[PDB]
């Protein structure tokens, strides 16, 4: 009616205000400012280690806080904790649901969580008096497949699911304490800040929302994509983040300013991006494409500074250690390779 | 070599036994028959308590030294494009239908048809980039209800370009041909058809025969004879 029409007109006016406010502060671009510094040389990374043991596709992994341990989740129904030094397997955890989509590692190294396509997130306790990895408590309340899960602290966890809602859970009570709504499309990924106070997410509606942990309300919405978003991660500084879509583009956003700084597009590749990660200093961008290969980019002039090809199937997960010693890649052929 | 202490020897033994357990458990799921159950929801999909039994819902049953696993995914309520690739090592994706209620045209919207929706679902599930080399079986419906409705009213003439009427054998044959002629591969994929009955064995022996045929064809393709 008339009220609906005037509300739509007001929404359009506010959208135009946001657009022109963003455009007013765009005075330069990152490339023409950082062109001064000399480009880095051709980087070459050899396969130091190759990890074997999975019998199906690998969907996610998480580098531990010790820069030497990690976990892996796969569709065969097994969760495996790895030791990157001697390639040893520390634990092999069976799963109740054979379908999994994500995994996480606690900052203190005691808790591991994995869940998806079962509407349930489970928390596993590693250091137990029973000597095994038994689930501490089972979290339920979602109506869609879980896509990502991250440990905010030893007792607080934030998750994303298939019902276009992200809920900040509480391990102690077992019930949600904050729910984030507003996504029209399905949410697929999220990342946490070093101070554990702000976190963003990406969804299938080509939108990125800046949420707040404490008061549980959104402040900023980021756009520019034209396809679904699968992976996202912050910057070590904490004032920027990079996104990965299915249209062969990776874009860099920032939190303090509402503009677009840095984007990637190459005509020789027409495949999407499945994982994105940063190194210690953030000089170079790692983006594991799904075209059977992985690519290493440079964050100065949008110039590829090397290639990393050791897989024969789809690349699904990436990760860089806390100290930036090594980078590990995953693929659906059930082979994890550590590169240094 | 000998640089490892007594700690690392036990660590290597632990890793070796974990590998042994994983390899042993990975061979048990290779011989388990994986079926995918799909339908519109009002297609007899609730009739599993007797037909096949003496997020995702899973049921298990055994028939003649075989392990069967069907996953009912009708209640997921999510974008099917984003999670369809999980079911790839599947064989014999069942599509239970109910077209005996087509002549009593129920659309749920008053501008659609049951047959149109069934064809749309069939095309969506049979014309994906994945799922190639995957066989399909069909369970049309219980034959009692169709007869009671076709004879009393000649509403079958509403079907697009159909000549006959008031014939039980011809209408069912035309429906079966229309469903079977929906594939676009025709060289690596086939459709198995069965008419359901009140007897439970008739709806299980057909599945057993279809899966045995699929396994034989797969082995022939593997060994190079085909």
């Amino acid at each position, epitope marked *: 009616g008339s009220e609906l029409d005037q509300l739509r007109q007001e929404a359009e006016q506010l959208k135009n205000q946001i657009r022109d406010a963003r455009k007013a502060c765009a005075d330069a671009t990152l490339s023409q400012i950082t062109n001064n510094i000399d480009p880095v040389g051709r980087i070459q990374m050899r396969t130091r280690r190759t990890l074997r043991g999975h019998l199906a596709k690998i969907y996610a992994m998480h580098w531990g806080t010790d820069s030497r*341990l990690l976990v892996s989740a796969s569709q065969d129904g097994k969760l495996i904790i790895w030791d990157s030094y001697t390639t040893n397997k520390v634990h092999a955890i069976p799963l109740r649901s054979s379908w999994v989509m994500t995994c996480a590692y606690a900052p203190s190294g005691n808790y591991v969580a994995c869940g998806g396509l079962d509407n349930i997130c489970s928390i596993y306790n590693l250091k137990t008096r*029973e000597g095994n990895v038994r689930v501490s408590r089972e979290l339920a309340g979602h109506t869609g497949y879980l896509s990502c899960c991250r440990f905010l602290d030893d007792n607080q966890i934030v998750t994303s699911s298939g019902d276009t809602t992200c809920a900040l859970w509480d391990i102690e009570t077992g019930q949600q304490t904050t729910t984030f709504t507003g996504h029209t499309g399905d949410v697929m990924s999220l990342s946490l800040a070093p101070d554990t106070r702000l976190f963003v997410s990406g969804a299938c509606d080509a939108s990125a929302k800046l949420w707040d942990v404490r008061e549980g309300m959104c402040r900023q919405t980021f756009t520019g994509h034209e396809s679904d978003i699968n992976a996202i991660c912050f910057f070590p500084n904490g004032n920027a983040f990079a996104t990965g879509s299915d249209d062969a583009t990776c874009r860099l956003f920032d939190l303090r300013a509402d503009q677009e700084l840095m984007t990637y597009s190459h005509d020789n590749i027409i495949c999407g991006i499945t994982s994105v990660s940063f190194s210690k200093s953030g000089r170079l961008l790692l983006a594991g494409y799904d075209d059977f290969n992985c690519n290493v980019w440079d964050a100065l002039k949008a110039d590829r500074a090397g290639v990393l090809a050791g897989h024969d199937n789809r690349v699904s997960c990436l990760g860089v250690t806390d100290d930036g010693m090594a980078v590990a890649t995953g693929s659906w052929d059930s082979f994890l390779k550590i590169w240094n | 070599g000998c640089t490892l202490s007594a700690e690392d020897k036990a660590a290597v033994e632990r890793s070796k036994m974990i590998d042994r357990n994983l390899r042993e458990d990975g061979e048990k799921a290779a011989r388990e028959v994986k079926l995918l159950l799909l339908g519109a929801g009002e297609s007899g999909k609730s009739t599993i308590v007797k037909q096949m039994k003496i997020g995702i819902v899973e049921t298990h049953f055994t028939f003649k030294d075989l392990h069967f696993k069907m996953f009912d995914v009708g209640g997921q309520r999510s974008e099917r494009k984003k999670w369809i690739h999980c079911f790839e090592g599947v064989t014999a994706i069942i599509f239970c239908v109910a077209l005996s209620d087509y002549d009593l045209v129920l659309a749920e919207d008053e501008e659609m048809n049951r047959m149109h929706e069934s064809m749309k679902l069939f095309d969506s599930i049979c014309n994906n980039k994945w799922f190639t080399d995957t066989s399909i079986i069909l369970f049309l419906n219980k034959k009692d209800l169709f007869e009671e409705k076709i004879k009393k009213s000649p509403l079958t003439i509403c079907y697009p370009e159909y000549a006959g009427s008031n014939t039980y054998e011809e209408a069912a044959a035309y429906i079966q041909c229309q469903f079977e002629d929906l594939n676009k591969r025709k060289d690596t994929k086939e459709i198995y058809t069965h008419f359901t009955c009140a007897t439970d064995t008739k709806n299980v022996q057909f599945v057993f025969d279809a899966v045995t045929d699929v396994i034989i064809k797969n082995n022939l393709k593997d060994c190079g004879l085909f």
Partner: single-chain antibody
Amino acid sequence: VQLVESGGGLVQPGGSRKLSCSASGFAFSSFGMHWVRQAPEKGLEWVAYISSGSGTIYYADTVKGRFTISRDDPKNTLFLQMTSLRSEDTAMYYCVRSIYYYGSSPFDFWGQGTTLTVSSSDIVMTQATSSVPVTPGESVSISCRSSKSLLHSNGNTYLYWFLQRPGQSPQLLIYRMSNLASGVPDRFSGSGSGTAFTLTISRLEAEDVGVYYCMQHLEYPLTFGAGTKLEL
């Protein structure tokens, strides 16, 4: 968890007897097994190590080829069969909830254990301290030294300490001289480097007194230190 062992008592040099162990509340089939020969009022030694699933078997030099050990995974029971004995086999055995993976400590959870009274790499054994009276409220320092540099390429130093109290089976207190065990008071501590190692207690009271032993973990048949009693 609770861990009951049997087989304690007096056994003649010529005869046969079997030890028993029961593991409840934790996976007995995924934890390395060990045996310790606690010699009373003196230094003691380590006995045997069998991994989960009987992958590897080890024996002490003094009892090599003389004892038999058999495991029962379904019953979570590890046995010990004997043929002939010597007077130097009096022991206090501990099935220890500890298996060698990164982040875990050998001899972590000793459980309870049982006794054995026999009727009548391997760093040498040395601990000069015998008994030192002390008043609560001041730090106490004792030293245990080695003969070889334990700083490998990885930097791991295999030095363990456990305290024994009268009438109670001793449990783990400090391992590695860098990581403190769990279920123990935080007052215990320690620091050392190179060859000589010194144990330091921050605060002293009635419950921080006992008999300490320093263990080295190099040749699975490893030698352990002497007992240093503390008097209130």
